Structures are given as structure tokens and as C-alpha cells.
Design a protein around this nucleic acid. Sequence first.
RNA 1: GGGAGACUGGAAUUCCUGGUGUAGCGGUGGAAUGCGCAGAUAUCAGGAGGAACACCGGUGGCGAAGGCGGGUCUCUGGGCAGUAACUGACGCUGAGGAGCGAAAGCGUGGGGAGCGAACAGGAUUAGAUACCCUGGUAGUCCACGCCGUAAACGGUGGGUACUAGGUGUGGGUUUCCUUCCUUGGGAUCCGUGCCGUAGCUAACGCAUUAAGUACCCCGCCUGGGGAGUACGGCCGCAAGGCUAAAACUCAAAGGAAUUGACGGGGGCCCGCACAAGCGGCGGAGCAUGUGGAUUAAUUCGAUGCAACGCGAAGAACCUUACCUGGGUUUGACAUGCACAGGACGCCGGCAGAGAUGUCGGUUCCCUUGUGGCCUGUGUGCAGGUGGUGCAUGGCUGUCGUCAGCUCGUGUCGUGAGAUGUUGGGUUAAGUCCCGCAACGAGCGCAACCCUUGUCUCAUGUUGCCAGCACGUUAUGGUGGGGACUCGUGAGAGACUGCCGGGGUCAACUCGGAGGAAGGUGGGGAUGACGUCAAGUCAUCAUGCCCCUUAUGUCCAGGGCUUCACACAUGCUACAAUGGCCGGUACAAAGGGCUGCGAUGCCGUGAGGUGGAGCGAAUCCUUUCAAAGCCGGUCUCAGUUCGGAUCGGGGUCUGCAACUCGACCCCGUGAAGUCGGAGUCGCUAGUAAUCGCAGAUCAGCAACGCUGCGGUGAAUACGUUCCCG
RNA 2: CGGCCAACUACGUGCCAGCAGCCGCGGUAAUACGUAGGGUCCGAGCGUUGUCCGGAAUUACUGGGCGUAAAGAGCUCGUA
Lengths: 153, 126, 207
Amino acid sequence: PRKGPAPKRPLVNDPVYGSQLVTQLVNKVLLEGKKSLAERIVYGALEQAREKTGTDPVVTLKRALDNVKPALEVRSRRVGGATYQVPVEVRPDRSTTLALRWLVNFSRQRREKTMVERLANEILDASNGLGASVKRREDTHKMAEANRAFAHY
Amino acid sequence: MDVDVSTDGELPGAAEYAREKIGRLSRRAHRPVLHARVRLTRHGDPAVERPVIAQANLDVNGRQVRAQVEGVNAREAVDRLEARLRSRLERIAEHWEARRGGVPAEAGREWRHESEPARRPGYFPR
Amino acid sequence: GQKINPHGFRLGITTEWKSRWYADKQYKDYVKEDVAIRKLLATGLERAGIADVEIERTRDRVRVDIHTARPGIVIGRRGTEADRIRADLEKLTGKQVQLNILEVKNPESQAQLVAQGVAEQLSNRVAFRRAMRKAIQSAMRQPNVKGIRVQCSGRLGGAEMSRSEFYREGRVPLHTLRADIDYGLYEAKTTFGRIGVKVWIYKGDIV
RNA sequence: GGGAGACUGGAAUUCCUGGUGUAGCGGUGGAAUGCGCAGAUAUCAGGAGGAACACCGGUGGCGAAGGCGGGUCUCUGGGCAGUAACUGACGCUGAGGAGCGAAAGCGUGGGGAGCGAACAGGAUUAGAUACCCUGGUAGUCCACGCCGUAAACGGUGGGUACUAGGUGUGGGUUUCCUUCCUUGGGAUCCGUGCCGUAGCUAACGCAUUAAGUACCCCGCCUGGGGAGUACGGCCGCAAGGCUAAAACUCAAAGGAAUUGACGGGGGCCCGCACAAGCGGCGGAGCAUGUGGAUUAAUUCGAUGCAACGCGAAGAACCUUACCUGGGUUUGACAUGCACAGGACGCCGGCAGAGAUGUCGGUUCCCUUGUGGCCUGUGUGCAGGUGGUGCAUGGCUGUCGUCAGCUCGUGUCGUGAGAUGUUGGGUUAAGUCCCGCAACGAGCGCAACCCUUGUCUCAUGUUGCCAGCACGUUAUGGUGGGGACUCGUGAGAGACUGCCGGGGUCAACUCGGAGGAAGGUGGGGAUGACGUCAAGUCAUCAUGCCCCUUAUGUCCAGGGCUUCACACAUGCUACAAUGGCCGGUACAAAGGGCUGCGAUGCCGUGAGGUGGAGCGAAUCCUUUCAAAGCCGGUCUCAGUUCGGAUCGGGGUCUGCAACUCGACCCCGUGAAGUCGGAGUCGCUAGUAAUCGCAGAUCAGCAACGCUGCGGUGAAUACGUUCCCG
RNA sequence: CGGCCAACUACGUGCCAGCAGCCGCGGUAAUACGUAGGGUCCGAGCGUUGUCCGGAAUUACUGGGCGUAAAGAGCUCGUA
């Protein structure tokens, strides 16, 4: 990345849902290359969500993503020999990445005895705006706002 | 400050002197010292004018500080090693007092690598 | 360790193996007898320049071909030298061993002979600059030689400090695979120690 | 703006008074002392006082130098130009001497706004008698006197004459373009800068304002310290200044310039260097290496990157180099000189831990000169993993697969040296292009080599089987067949080749088509001159030194495995993305002759018996896997997690598993709840994870190393910071 | 008897004993120490010490300098 940007990997659309986002989600939950287990977990969580709410799972997944998607983030900047927490605008792709990573992790530290159940509960509460990922977005926005004085550089 | 000395061959009392001298350098270090090792070696060849070789390694909060000297006996080598280590620790400080003269100053006077670039308008001043 | 041996770099491409036989169960003892033959020939003959020794084997009969710059020295007019080498090669458990003594066409274009001569001159009394200059000039005088580098290191001139010196003339492209680099190394025996002489000779390329 | 005196102006700071007006102000890299809430800071009006004079205002003017700019008035010094009226050499320098002489300081008397030594707190720091902050006294200011020093420097004494020019700028006189407005231009005199000849200089540089060419006068120097110090003297209120030694000590101290290296100097670039991510180490248990300690010995070597699962690709005996003890000496092993021989040599017995010793049986072929064997006696000698990798060769690591390192001739310089190799662009690249006192060349870069990705021809066994027949479940199993894979030979294919656009119409660059592949396709091998007296006399070889009834050499036993600790690399976990049980599917690569070893049978299991077939595209390693998929169970617990430790029982290898092997069975069931400071690897078939194989090897300490395939991510905004 | 400065090897020793006018030589392989061979220079002499001149243009009359190497008084006026 010294000589310029690197190309992005065009991951394929999912077969049984036809959405880019679910493939991104399965790649986020993937561990040690066991892709089949990751797909089983994601599909099971989506089906659990569909059973609980009664509608399409992708729409509620998108609602949760929008509820946990951040817009303002803070990065340490060194200008003139001094470092400060500068609020910075987040590009759409990085916002989707951050939202998915937050969802997967905060589901990993739930207490629902199974990762499929934890993931389903986390996505449902994120849809309704009660998840811990929603909270995390709240604190990141709060921190970005509280350092607004440093946004001029 | 705990120091481990790994000598070799014949160097009686070199370990104790080296430990006592090196352990006094902890207060000079501005960050906690995680590890400290000293090695004393002697040259087999009698033709070597400075046979004894002393080396040190300190882990100053992740920053590696090392020095190496030669002497005619253990005491001189240890003392020269202590001097070299003190110089290195002085040059390593990196707290505010050690970097207050290098921080860019003024507004337009003086220029440095990390000096803040001047803000320029779109249109030429004229 | 800087440069790999030039012969081994081009072993499958330009240069060729100096031992030609096939063995599956008897590879190990074949190797043992080959190295025994080589060391015997190295120790026995030193006057005539022994540039290369090839060994060929086929069941009972063993064929050993050697190249020297003075074939008359190593061969007996009545076969006395031939008798001695034949008998003590039979004693090497070689069963039937036959010898084809040969001669090199241009001794000054052969790296091993050049190094041998330079080291022999170095041993007695000669300053190393003289030896390197003479060898370089003699080799470049030959028609096919396109470049020669001579390097010797050690206690040159009986000094207490070891030194490395080298002179080059022409082109010696060590990194080029197709270029054939003739490599020769031989150690000079002096009263103050051992001096090693390496010679690289470049004569065109083989495609 | 030459100096002295008097008077006087406005902006701003501070303070005081009075309004409005509230809760902070002030200060810093970040804060705190501090001020304010008793009314601060802010804003307005008024008043007092002191000091300095924005713009004009500059490398511009004046002064002998120090130095000199708010305005006005008074007194006063010097300079320059023109006319050349006057005098007629009245000139120059100047030892001593006299005068002036920044700032600080001193005395007496005033003044005192701001600033501010000292001094107080605050902060930073390991410590801050400092830098930074808040206060703040002398002082800074005035009058009159002392002092008499400065990087008081142009580090260049004064006067004079001469020696190419070009171009700014200040003061004044004059001819011609002439509008005569205009730096019009010229000439001339006096200043003040820059650039440049000749010349000078060690060089840097100076160069009509000389550091050039000469003449007159003055001051000063004679190696560096001691020392501008002591003593004496003079001056001073004092501080102190001026004049000014020696003893002793060093073999230098110095000036300019060159090449490197370095910088908490600048510019331009790179790299998993950082940033964005994923997984770890540091915590636990165990494996392995090292330090330390211990021991009779714990053989030796390796100490940042670049030592520490390293030499060791295999320590029970051997290895083995160490310790204890027991033997032996031309020796355990070579070759030569001699005297005696027909035996050496084996085969058994006994003693011994064994080395070894002794006893019983067997005895040379040449050919007459002796040759092969050994004996002893010997004698040269062998033999050292004894020392020095700072005496070495060879081999290797490393900066670094970074792009750099040099040479010939020419030119510049007294010379070290420089140029080429720098400048603009470009590249992964000293790669290339354009320029250029340089023109070329060499080692490097790249290419040529291997593997991998596509296709064509050839090719059919032990390899394929699509179309045909025989098959019995057991399948290419079998007759047969090149079709498709595959194996291995040859070849084609990527060359910015083509198109469009940027580009100096140049390098190069962006995009598109075709193609299996696009811009060195992916990965290897290949490591310039050198550096680090880097490593290795323990692979080997080797100079010198040392041992030689031993530091050689044989043997048994022990040790290299010791353990209060420390460090390093790993493996296994701490679980439900999981544990256990059952079923079930897909690899590649490699190995095998006194080796792989199948079917079968016996064990629960290591395994035992047995031996089919295989020097192997055939047989065996099972027909080959594990993660994977399906089903059942466990239900968040120190648990059906975790397996350490320990008890008992076995198997195999081996002469022999006590020290000190691996594996199997039953029982036992520790720490461990995701790990502080800190730190590591990785950019795609990569990280993570899963299994398989090989070397060493009787067995194994292998969780190590070298390979092979399965499943297979996230992220890179960008170079400010860390490292090179 | 290393170079100045004619004239080199072996043995002994090893940062010792020692040498030395200066530079500097002694660290088990010293042309520099000590001793022997050999050599060179002088020779009834040969070396050492002391003192003066030369080399020294290093007090420069012959025959030196003062921008940065030591060296222009801080600047003027003016007496001999």
C-alpha cells in the first residue's frame, strides 16, 4: 500500500438467498476455513430469525445492519508532532465491514448456548435497536462527537 | 533490577562486579526494564591486546539496548560497558524532555520534516 | 559464502558429470571405490598437470580416463608407470581396470592447469602479482579465451595478515547459465601456511 | 537618523475611578501554581504615569570609532561638487602622551509603566540549583561623575601612485537624443554593493573599496599548555583593568580542503516498516535448546538482528570427544631399515566386569635368494575431537536479491581527489531515454535453467476404458480398444504483438481486444566489490606451539538426561464453530531385498504366528487420509472439557530399557475459565486449520526438520509516526 | 647492521628481561632485546657524555610574516 491501492476480491452472491451481504456474513463468521460449518451457522440463524418474526430474513438483516452501521469514527492523527483523536468520516464499505464484525463478535460473547441461537438473538435485537452492537455504535458516535474540536485537521 | 550474567572460562568475580555495576542503571532508564543479560568472554590468543569482551542487552519496555566493549581485564571491560550503556540510555530517553527540542516550533520560522505545511488558497495571492 | 561452484551451477546444462555409470544396490561401494581411485591418482601424480579424471564402469570392467598436460611423464616407455598404476588399481578391488591416458590440447586454456601452475610458482619464491599477471596474459593469448579471472588468498608473501587479491580481464559472467565458465581451484603449499588459488575462465557460450 | 539643549504629539501596556455585565479568566506540547466570584476577564467613559517612537525604513544616509531615525525650535561639527580668487610643500606617519569609547557594573540624588539577573512557587525529570509557566528585586530611564572593557570584526593600521571590464544604488556638476515631460543617453568627481580578468594565496578566496604591483611611518608574532596567571608596579570607591614571567610538561597544537560515517538537518523514494485486518507469544501443563547452579564428570562449539527443535538427518552400550577404575605401549592403525622363524591365523576350555591372560587342536605358499605374517628386539616413526578461526585454505551467515561497486583513456586540481556514476523523466532495477568534459568497458540488474498454468504431434504398459465381448460380485476383474485422462519426448504459445489515449513523438504509462495466461504470469535456482579480524583448527586440510610410558590407545561402569530458578522455540488445551459413538466421500507426494510385507488365524490392544506378491505406474505402504457430510447423545459444569502426574499390568527392538526408549490396557484426573507491560508472522490458494510422507534410524526422546496435498478467510484509507 | 644511514641470518626470551636520537620495537616463529655467524664504517684508536656553531629562512640586514594558521592597538588627535 506504499505504491497504491490493492484490488478487492469480488466474492460471489449466495445461492440460497441471492444477496452479497449474507456471503459477507458467512466469511466474517468463518473460522479455520471450515466454510460449510459457517454456512450452516448463518443459514440456521437466518431461519431462526424468519421463524421468530415471520418475514423474510434478509430484510431484517439489512435493518440490523443499518441500525449498527456507523458513520463517524475516530482515528489517531499525528500533525505537527502531536497526536489527537480526530473524528473521521467512514466510507460505506468500511461501515458495512465494521457493522458485520461487531455483529459477529458480540454474538460470539452472548449466552445462548449455541452460536446459531446467539447470532439470531443478536441480529433480532439489532433489528429492534437493543443489541450490544447498537450500543457500540452509540459509544463510537459519542466519542466521535466529543472530539469534534479536532475535526479541523 | 535483576541481571543474569553468562560468563565462560575463567573470570573470577567478574559476574558479581558486572551484576552490581549494571543493576545501577535501572534508575537511568526512563521505562521499566523487562530483561537484562550480560556476557563476559575472554580471547584465547595471548597476542590480543584487549582480550576480555563484555556485551549487554536490556529490554527497556520493548526497546532493545545493547553495547559491546573490549578491555584488558574484567573490571575495565565492565566499567566501559557501563559507560556505553549509560550513553545509549541517554540517547534513547524519548520522554517529553528528550523530544522537546525536536518538536517543530514557531509558525513560519524554521522548517522540519514533520512541520505543519502552510495552508494555501485556491487563487494565486497577487 | 558468496558464490556457488560454477561447475555445479551448470551441471545439467553446460558441464558434464565426471563419473558415468548406473548402480542401484551398489551405488555406495561404487562411490567408495571411485573416491579411492581419485585420491590415489591425486597423491601419486603431481608433476604432470592432472586436469581431470573420468571414471566409467560396466559390470566387471572399469574404464578410467585422465587428462594431463605432460602425458609422457605419467606413462612408462616400457609401461613401468603403466605397470605400477595398473597393478595398484587392481589392488583397489577394481576387478578389470583399464586406463586411457590423454592430453589436453591447450594447457593454458584449462583452469585447473592454470591454477596448478600459479600455485606452484607461488610456493617456491614468486611474488603473487607476477604469477597472476603471467597466467592472465598466457590465457588471454589463446584464441578461445574470452575472459579469465584469477584470485588467490591467504598469507600472501609470508605476511602475518591474510589478504585476498584478484585480477580480471575480459568478460566473466558467472550469473549466466549458458556461458561455460571453467573453474579451477588448487592450494599452494608455502612455509607459512596454505594459499588457495581460484581460476575462472570464460570461453564463449554453448547453446 | 552627525552632536548638544529645550519644548512638545499620538498609538499601545499598566494602574485608579465610574457604568454594563456575568462565571470564568490566564497559561502550555499538556497542565498546575496564579487572578475572580468581596464581582474577575470582556466592553464603555474619564484620569495618572513611565518608557519606546509603527508605517516612512532598505543591505539607504551620516559619523574616526562606539554609534545615530516621533515632531519643532535654538546652538554646533564634518563631508561633497563647481569656480579656481588666495598661500606657496605649509605634506605623511607617529614611540610615549592626551581625548573619545556598546553593554554590564559602581557613587550621589530622582523616577519606576513594561521588561527583568537574583529570589519564590508550578511543571518536566531518575535528579532539575535549567529550558517552559505565574510572580518578581536590583537594573533598564534622568542629572552629574567613575569604569575603560566586547566576536569594540571587514577577525583586513594610516597615506600615496598604478593595474580589463560589466551591472545596481546615494550625492553633485555638465554635452548631445530632445518630447526637453523621461533612470533619455553620454562624460566627469565623490561614496556604497554584486559579478568578474590579469595578478596573488596552502586553500578558501581577494580582486580599482586588493588580500595585486610599489614607496614612507607605526603596532604586533616567533610551538602548545602553565598564563594574559603569579610576583612587583600603576590606575580604580569597588568590580577589576594595564604591564607581565618562570619552574614544570607535551611532540604536538593548528589552518584549508578531500573521501567516508553520522545528525533528535532538508528533499525524493522503497519494504508486512507502520496503518487496516486475521492468528498468535508473554499466563498453564508438557517437549526441546540455553544460562545459572550442582556434580567425579555434567565433553566441545554456537551469544542482537545474523546464538538458544543451532553443529545433533536419531546420546541406553557404540556414538563419546567427559568422569571413576582396570590394561597398554613402535602403540588401536600405517610405511621403511635390521636379527631370529615357519607360522600368522583361527577353533574350543578356563579366569576376569571386560580389555586381556593362559591352556588344548590346525598349520604357509615362493624357491634357495628370499618375497607375503607376525612375533619380540628394536629403529626412523605413528598417533592427538591438544592450543591458537586475531597465522590460514576451504566452506558458510549477514547487510541483501539491496542496486549498487569499479576500471581504461581523456579532462579539472599542487594534492588527497573529482568527472563518468551528476541534472530532468522513467523503471522492480546504475532499467531505459533526453541532456551533459566526457567517451567506453567490467562485475552486478535483466535474460539464458527448473517447476507450474493452455494447446498440438508422437505415445499405449504396470497407466486410461468411450464404443464392443466374457465376467460374479469383487472390482478394468478379464479379452480387447488411442477415444478421453495420464505418464514422457518434441513443439507452439506473451513478444506492449495489436488498438485507443497520455506522453519530447522518447523512454515509459493508462485502458481495450484476442487469449489458458498481459505487461519481469506464479514459485524456485542464481547472492556484485566488500563489511562484521562474523562462525568453523571438532567434516576436512593446515603454519607454529605443546603431549608422547602420556593430552596417544583398549575395556567395564557412569555422565552428556543432574534442578531453588531464568530465558528461547514449540505442542496440547482452557471447549458447544465443541467432546464421544455409529455410518459415509474425496488427495498428492514418497519409500521398500536379508526390506515392504497382504489374505488368514490368535489377542481388547500394542502386537504374536504365518507368509501371497513385490527391486516394484504391477505387490506392500491397506483398496490409502483427516478436517468434511449424515444420524444419536452430552447441555455450559473445572464438566462426557483438559490431559499432566502417579499405581498396577503388558508388547516390541536390542547383548541389555535402573540411571535412560517407544507403544498398549485398567485405574488415577493436576494446572488451566483465553493470559500485564510488551511483542511476533502473514497481502491469496496466502494466513488459519486438517491429515500424509521422507531423511537420520535395531529401536526411539520426532510435538523437531524437509516436503505433499484437503478445506480455505479478513484487510490495505494512506506514508505523519516506529524499524531497516 | 628497521628507516634516517654503509651493512642480515640463526638461536634464546615472550608486554618479561630489555632497547631507544626520533619514529618506536619486546604477545613462543623479533633483520629493533641478548648471544653467535656474516657484514659495514673507522682504525691506535673507537664510542658515550658535556659545551658552541651549522642544518634553522626558527629574530629573516643579506633573508620571514600579521583575513581564517601566532600576529593590525577599539578609534582618533598630537609630542620626540
